[PDB]
Design a protein around this nucleic acid. Structure first.
Ligand SMILES: Nc1nc2c(ncn2[C@@H]2O[C@H](COP(=O)(O)OP(=O)(O)OP(=O)(O)O)[C@@H](O)[C@H]2O)c(=O)[nH]1
Ligand SMILES: [Mg+2]
Lengths: 154, 160, 50, 116, 141, 161, 66, 465, 58
RNA sequence: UGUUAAUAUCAUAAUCAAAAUUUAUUAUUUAUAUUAAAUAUGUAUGUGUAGAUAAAAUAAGAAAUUA
């Protein structure tokens, strides 16, 4: 794991909105599915999201379905509940992927990026070789060299 | 065919570190070579900062030399042969004609009339067959003759 | 590898043959080619983009 | 004391990669074990064709000059003392035109001109 | 386009006040250069601390075995000689030959500025408080 | 040389006051930001930092898997499978009228930063501790995964009659 | 047209020694290497009472002290 | 659809154990009439029963038979289809059957000496040749399971990349002029002993030092298993010298014993037939420099490329070529292989994208190879799958990943049927074995499939009428 | 062969394509080649642009 | 929107090197590896952090409150 400097915190909604660019990054959906097929877990969530985004990509170059001029307006919050179920599906999936990687990194004994919490080894985030001698979120002075996380037998 | 990133990225506003975004000159671009074009901190534009790590064409030239370094690494790694200057009399027959130089004629065929249009610029000869040529008169052959694999021989490969 | 550029006369071999550095010398004589001698061997880069 | 300080004194001819000063018999693995590991090894060096090995291929190089070959491991270029092209970028012919954007031309000749 | 106003006169004697100002400025540069070369060459000849990172293999192996035993049993004198500086350290590693290419591909080395602190430092404030008057391009302790 | 022990005019010059704050205009203070992560809520901090898994890590994991699988070990396996059965049950259809609130318009300019600032500062507070839209707990039945670490096939000497 | 001493040589891509001839590179001087094995082994069995680890530096690896 | 009135059949093998929740594999494996499934986990068959009528079909190994017969692990990528829930399923290819018959002659090689010489063409064992994209290391693992189900002493080298490309190399302690493989061989002793504890407990030493330096209270090695136990059950860094001692004298034992049949199976002898990624350490590392300014030293200043160590310069390969090249050991059989796990090179190469690199753990080798000119072994050509073995292997994948739920499950109405999923897999692989194993995985992102929407239109068009 | 299967609906595709009997040469098509072939070919093509003896004796 | 074709009647201000920031109308390179060619920027580590502000529906992938 090379990238160990600081990272930018983006919410799931915008991490998903990047659509088929990185959210439905097919080669990233695949490479996280490989973590699941290694660990021996069912890929129910990532496969659900892949189905949804395959639909969305197939029906991105197309126009929405026509609205009717209803003062009573039902289509609106119905398509709203539809979208926000898709969104909640993807929020769950986002969390599953993050959890599996931050656990598999404690299993491979590999260090995560800076202040990337891994509850497999340390209840707080991994701070080490940082652009600041203070904790980026706790404001705790860093040890030199980077703090050590796993055992020493490799 | 190469899924590497050959081009230095356009000098634009600051690519942050999130999903789909690294530092424009982090440790992973060109195997850590962006260390030679990276500067640290929100540089004071007027007074600090090296004027040649802000331009696009010079940083791209550096990156091009580094890509060429890579091509040279893999190319010279790809050699299990060396170029041994054999006189004309002793070289095996496929190297006894007018072989035009590099980039001179079409990359010439070994021999058409013998069912081998194999690159004679890319034909490799083994010491243990050119032994009679080079160090023929040097006593005991420093390598043994080659042990061959018999394909008419009735072994497990012929379903017995 | 750190190899000494060696060149054996057309007289030492038990078959004489015109050797390639001598041919280089004949060519830098005919077409007045400067032979830069500080030319290191590890820098045979070609311009891939070109 | 010119060689005591490697990077101060660079002739307008001096060129890189700056070759290191040679040890005794670093040539191959047979000679390496013969002099360096097993001083009593049977074979003097890898039995050599009496002919010419143009190791440095195809670069014809000055004999009697201790040279390197183009490296193999992608580490040594990262870990050499090779600089990056900092100042302007010249080519002895292109330098007439002074830049890409202001590319000069004497006559309006075609770019695919097949000179006789 | 309004007609650019002429710069007013420089003033009285200021040509010589700038004379004396720059005079004692290069005067001050005398000592600044002296002290800065002092600090840079002590930085140079000082045995530095580890350039690698102990967060990756093969430098995550125990400080007793593997590449560490090779480091103690072939290069333990050379590193102390050449002052642990990351550049000569990595080149002695390139010439140790029994690690292959790994001294780049698998080895993780500290950043340029985490690498140039002297031997055995334990603070993170060292790099961020090194003296800012020694114009060493950060090549001082 | 002989550096004068008194300085005439150069050292007397007005002190350029150091930049007070950090960041844009060197004015952005030292106080918490939208970007701060939380270590008290979930195994994945919220908001998380972007991680990136590589094929190096996929292979290291595959090799770790061969070892922990051929060492008879299945405990970290069943831990994996339980931390999977925690978060991978289908979350309920949202109640009709439940929607992520967009930032209300007609306060800031269209290109403002407070619009995305409120979005991030609400998506932070909506932690996994606040995920009430998915089934989690001892109140959930799982008709799709296996109930006890005894139904896993590595302990297959248990279901035999 | 003056003689073979001017006939220009050929460039042959003479392959490096293959595996069939690289396999003999472990048995070259097998007799002497195994003998110095049998002797160094006795010095090593001795040394294992002197230090925690017996490197080949004290067996067949040699350096000038200064 | 017969989910409640489906009952689970009993547990007798691991493949009987990995049945997924009926809801997960429900529509995947149709339950038809007591109602039972159409597709089933394949039977854990023993090789002593495996014969001409298991060819092109999938048998497997249970966790027990595997942990019994593969303690060092498997070869290159061989745990890729073996997540915990997956039954580790091997195909009975038409050349793997030839190898099983060869081993069937092995455990009586003495009576079948001329038999195997007719079968080996006097060439010591077989090297498995074929491109990147075949079943080489898995084939060798099948061979290893074969032999160890025949009670044969099997030296199974799981990867020659570990032996010639470790994290370090070293001078062999009792092998002047040579080297040994410290950590790869550290694992070799530990797992060869903990593998063949059966033969090596009754094994007795023939040409070994009975004056071994043993830590106080630790029992002197008298078996061949005691040798290795003393050899890897020790404190470091003493383990490195103990392991080179163990490699040399274990090879002397294995080249001295003439009676018990011995199987030796090496994954990737093309990475043994040439130079190791280690090179020779600098001579200025052999002389204890005195000072830096004036010594004529350019190791701290500049790197250089000292010549490369051929794999014949390690002690394990030392004894291995000592077994191959030295005849009069018609008891040992060298089933080695050819790995092609290097990075690609196709005219150019930029700087491979870190996050996107499926060959990072490939070896920066690029170098050629020739099965004939580079081996004493006889080449066994394991070409690519026919659509035959492709289809059988893939049915196993695509339906047992269901029956353990590792795949599509209750989302099965989205990815196509078998006869089109297989068409897609076999296109995207060109029947290549690896392309198949990875385009059964990249199946997630197949973004141009209409079988299910055309069938949904047929249902929401006819289920009106 | 696909050139032989009557994909047509109403009128009979007779005669069939005369290609309905072409051989298969992996040495001719598909176009497979190695990279030094590609490179030397193209750069030689490029450099030999000028070497035209426009006055042959044809 | 500076240099351009009819009003006269204060004064020579015009690059051939090395150059003096007050001028709103500007996208800086972010921690594995940091000075070799006309010389080429030594300052601003800090919870991505006040206020107000920039851009864009165009090969990328956006979806619903008309005057
Ligand atoms: N369970 C099982 N998996 C197999 C089998 N055959 C192939 N595979 C799977 O697919 C992997 C790839 O096949 P191999 O030929 O063995 O892999 P490899 O190319 O030698 O590995 P590398 O040298 O690292 O490239 C296998 O190693 C297994 O993971 C088999 O018979 N049973
Ligand atoms: Mg393999």
């Amino acid at each position: 794991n090379t990238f160990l400097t600081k990272s930018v915190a983006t919410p799931p909604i915008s991490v998903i909105r990047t659509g088929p660019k990185w959210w439905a990054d097919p080669e990233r959906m695949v490479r996280q599915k490989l973590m699941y097929f290694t660990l021996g877990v069912d890929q129910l969530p990532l496969r659900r999201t892949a189905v949804i985004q395959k639909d969305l990509h197939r029906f991105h170059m197309c126009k929405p379905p026509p609205r009717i001029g209803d003062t009573t307006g039902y289509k609106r919050s119905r398509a709203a509940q539809l979208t926000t179920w898709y969104r909640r599906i993807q929020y769950q999936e986002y969390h599953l992927q993050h959890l599996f990687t931050r656990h598999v990194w404690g299993l491979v004994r590999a260090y995560p990026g800076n202040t990337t919490k891994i509850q497999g080894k340390a209840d707080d985030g991994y701070v080490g070789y940082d652009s600041v001698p203070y904790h980026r979120y706790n404001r705790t002075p860093l040890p030199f060299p980077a703090r050590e996380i796993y055992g020493r037998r490799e | 065919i190469s899924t590497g990133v050959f081009d230095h990225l356009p000098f634009q506003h600051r690519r942050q570190h999130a999903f789909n975004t690294l530092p424009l000159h982090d440790a992973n671009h060109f195997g850590g070579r962006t260390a030679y074009l990276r500067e640290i901190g929100p540089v004071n534009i007027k007074k600090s900062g090296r004027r040649f790590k802000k331009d696009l064409r010079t940083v791209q030239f550096n990156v091009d030399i580094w890509c060429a370094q890579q091509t040279l690494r893999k190319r010279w790694k790809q050699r299990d042969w060396e170029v041994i200057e054999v006189p004309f009399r002793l070289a095996p027959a496929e190297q006894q004609r007018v072989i035009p130089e590099m980039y001179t004629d079409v990359p010439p065929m070994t021999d058409p009339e013998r069912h081998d249009f194999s690159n004679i610029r890319n034909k490799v000869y083994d010491r243990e067959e050119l032994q009679g040529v080079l160090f023929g008169a040097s006593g005991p052959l420093p390598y043994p003759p080659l042990q061959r694999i018999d394909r008419q021989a009735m072994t497990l490969d012929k379903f017995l | 590898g750190v190899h000494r550029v060696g060149y054996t006369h057309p007289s030492t071999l038990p078959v004489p043959c015109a050797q390639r550095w001598d041919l280089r010398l004949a060519r830098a004589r005919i077409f007045q080619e400067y032979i830069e001698e500080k030319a290191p061997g590890a820098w045979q880069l070609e311009d891939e983009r070109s | 004391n010119a060689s005591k300080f490697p990077h101060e004194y660079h002739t307008p001819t001096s060129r890189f990669p700056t070759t290191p000063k040679e040890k005794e018999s670093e040539s191959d693995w047979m000679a390496y074990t013969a002099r360096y590991l097993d001083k009593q090894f049977t074979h003097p060096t890898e039995p050599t064709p009496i002919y010419n090995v143009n190791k440095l291929w195809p670069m014809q190089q000055v004999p009697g000059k201790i040279d390197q070959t183009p490296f193999e491991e992608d580490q040594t270029w990262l870990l050499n003392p090779i600089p990056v092209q900092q100042l302007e970028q010249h080519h002895p012919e292109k330098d007439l035109q002074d830049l890409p954007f202001v590319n000069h031309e004497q006559f309006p000749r075609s770019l695919e001109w097949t000179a006789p | 386009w309004a007609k650019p106003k002429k710069r007013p006169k420089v003033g009285q004697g200021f040509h010589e006040k700038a004379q004396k100002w720059r005079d004692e400025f290069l005067l001050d540069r005398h000592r600044i250069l002296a002290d800065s070369l002092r600090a840079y060459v002590e930085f140079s000849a000082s045995k530095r601390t580890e350039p690698w990172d102990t967060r990756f293999r093969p430098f995550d192996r125990v400080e007793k075995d593997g590449v560490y035993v090779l480091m103690r049993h072939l290069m333990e004198d050379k590193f102390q000689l050449c002052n642990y500086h990351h550049r000569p350290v990595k080149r002695l590693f390139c010439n140790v030959g029994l690690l292959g290419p790994q001294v780049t591909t698998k080895a993780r080395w500290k950043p340029y500025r985490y690498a140039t602190n002297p031997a055995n430092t334990s603070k993170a404030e060292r790099i961020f408080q090194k003296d800012k008057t020694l114009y060493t391009h950060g090549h001082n302790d | 040389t002989a550096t004068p022990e008194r300085f005439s005019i150069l050292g007397t010059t007005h002190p350029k006051p150091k930049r007070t704050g950090f960041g844009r205009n060197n004015k952005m203070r030292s106080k918490p930001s939208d970007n701060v992560a939380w270590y008290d809520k979930g195994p994945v901090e919220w908001l998380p930092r972007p991680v990136r898994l590589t094929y190096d890590h996929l292979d290291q994991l595959r090799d770790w898997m061969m070892r922990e699988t051929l060492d008879g070990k299945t405990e970290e396996f069943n831990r994996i499978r339980d931390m999977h059965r925690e978060w991978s049950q289908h979350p309920l259809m949202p109640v009709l009228g439940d929607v992520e609130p967009k930032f209300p318009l007609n306060l800031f300019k269209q290109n403002h930063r407070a619009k995305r600032r409120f979005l991030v500062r609400w998506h932070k507070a909506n932690t996994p501790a606040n995920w009430l839209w998915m089934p989690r707990g001892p109140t959930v039945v799982t008709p799709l995964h296996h109930t006890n670490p005894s139904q896993y096939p590595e302990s297959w000497r248990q279901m035999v009659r | 047209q003056l003689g073979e001493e001017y006939w220009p040589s050929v460039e042959m891509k003479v392959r490096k020694p293959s595996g069939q001839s690289k396999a003999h590179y472990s048995l070259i001087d097998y007799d002497r290497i195994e003998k110095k094995s049998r002797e160094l082994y006795e010095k090593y069995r001795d040394a294992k009472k002197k230090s925690l680890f017996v490197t080949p530096m004290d067996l067949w690896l040699e350096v000038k002290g200064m | 659809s017969l989910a409640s009135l489906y009952v689970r059949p009993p547990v007798t093998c691991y493949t009987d154990a990995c049945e997924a929740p009926v809801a997960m594999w429900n529509g995947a494996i149709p339950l038809k009439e007591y109602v039972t499934k159409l597709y089933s986990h394949p039977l854990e068959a023993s090789p002593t029963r495996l014969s001409f009528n298991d060819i092109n079909s999938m048998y497997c190994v249970g966790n027990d038979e595997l942990m019994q017969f593969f303690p060092e692990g498997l070869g290159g990528k061989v745990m890729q289809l073996m997540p915990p829930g997956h039954p580790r399923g091997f195909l009975y290819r038409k050349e793997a059957h030839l190898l099983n018959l060869f081993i069937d002659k092995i455990q009586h090689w003495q009576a079948k000496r001329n038999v195997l010489s007719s079968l080996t063409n006097n060439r010591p064992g077989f090297i498995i040749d074929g491109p990147k994209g075949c079943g080489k290391s898995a084939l060798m693992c099948q061979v290893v399971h074969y032999a160890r189900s025949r009670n044969l002493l099997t030296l199974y080298v799981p990867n020659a990349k570990e032996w010639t490309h470790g994290e370090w190399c070293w001078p062999s302690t009792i092998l002047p002029g040579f080297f040994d493989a410290p950590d790869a061989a550290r694992f070799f002793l530990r797992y060869f002993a903990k593998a063949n504890r059966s033969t090596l407990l009754s094994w007795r030493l023939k040409c070994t030092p009975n004056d071994l330096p043993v830590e106080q209270g630790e029992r002197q090695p008298q078996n061949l298993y005691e040798l290795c136990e003393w050899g890897h059950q020790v404190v470091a860094p003493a383990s490195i010298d103990r392991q080179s001692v163990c490699v040399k004298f274990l090879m002397d034992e294995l080249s001295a014993e003439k009676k018990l049949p011995i199987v030796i199976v090496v994954d990737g002898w093309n990475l043994f037939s040439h130079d190791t990624h280690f090179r020779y350490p600098h001579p200025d590392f052999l002389r204890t420099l005195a000072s830096l300014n004036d010594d004529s030293t350019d190791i701290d200043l500049y790197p250089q490329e000292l010549p490369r160590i051929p794999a014949s310069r390690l002690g394990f390969v030392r004894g291995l070529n000592k077994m191959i090249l030295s005849k009069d050991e018609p008891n040992k059989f060298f089933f080695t292989c050819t790995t092609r796990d290097f990075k690609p090179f196709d005219g150019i190469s930029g700087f491979p994208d870190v996050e996107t690199d499926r060959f990072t753990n490939s070896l920066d080798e690029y170098a050629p190879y020739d099965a004939e000119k580079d081996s004493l072994f006889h080449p066994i050509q394991l070409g690519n799958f026919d659509e035959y073995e492709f289809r059988a292997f893939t049915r196993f994948l695509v339906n047992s990943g269901e029956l353990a739920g590792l795949g599509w499950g209750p989302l099965w109405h989205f990815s196509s049927d078998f006869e089109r999923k297989l068409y897609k897999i076999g296109f995207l692989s060109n029947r290549n074995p690896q392309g198949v194993i990875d385009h059964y995985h990249q199946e997630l992102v197949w973004r141009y499939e209409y079988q299910r929407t055309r069938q949904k239109q047929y249902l929401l068009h006819r289920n009106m009428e | 062969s696909p050139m032989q299967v009557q994909r047509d609906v109403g009128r009979s595709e007779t005669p069939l394509p005369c290609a309905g009997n072409i051989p298969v040469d992996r040495s001719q098509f598909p176009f497979c080649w190695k990279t030094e072939d590609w490179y030397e070919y193209e750069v030689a093509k490029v450099r030999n642009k000028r070497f035209v003896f426009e006055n042959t004796e044809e």
